[PDB]
């Protein structure tokens, strides 16, 4: 087996679910609206 | 027999009785005699 029985499932899941909430918030509040700023900035110049 | 000739014969058959008008019947008349030509030289102007 290439490892298929740890007992570290809850350990794993703690760091795993933490990473998901971190990336979700991080994207949503930080990195996505600065991309929406690029879109809007280009269009605001385009529109005038 | 050509496809539109096939349809033509069908149209004529549909023109076969008293349940229909004169104009159809007039459209079911043939005059011309196709004047075959050659070379100048004319093979006979056989009825269409």
């Amino acid at each position: 087996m290439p490892q298929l029985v740890p007992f570290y499932f809850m350990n794993q899941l703690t760091y795993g679910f933490l990473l998901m909430i971190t990336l979700l918030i991080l994207f949503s509040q930080f990195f996505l609206p600065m991309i929406l700023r690029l879109y809007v900035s280009r269009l605001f110049i385009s529109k005038l | 027999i050509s496809y539109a000739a096939y349809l033509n014969v069908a149209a004529q058959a549909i023109r076969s009785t008293e349940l229909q008008t004169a104009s159809v019947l007039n459209r079911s008349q043939t005059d011309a005699f196709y004047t075959q030509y050659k070379n100048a030289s004319e093979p006979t102007p056989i009825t269409k």
């Binding site: - | 050509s2 496809y3 539109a4 349809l7």
Partner: protein, 56 residues
Amino acid sequence: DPVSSLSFEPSEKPIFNAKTIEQSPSFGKFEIDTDANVPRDLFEYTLANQMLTAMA
């Protein structure tokens, strides 16, 4: 072609061969058959359909 009721202009048109129908670019947007020789049928049909109109 009886251009106006006071004019007539002699006019011509080109009859599209069945070979043409085959190789027409938007032939691909008219499709349903290949076991019917629709070019060979349509050519014949429009040979007459065009001709009658021209004669009229």
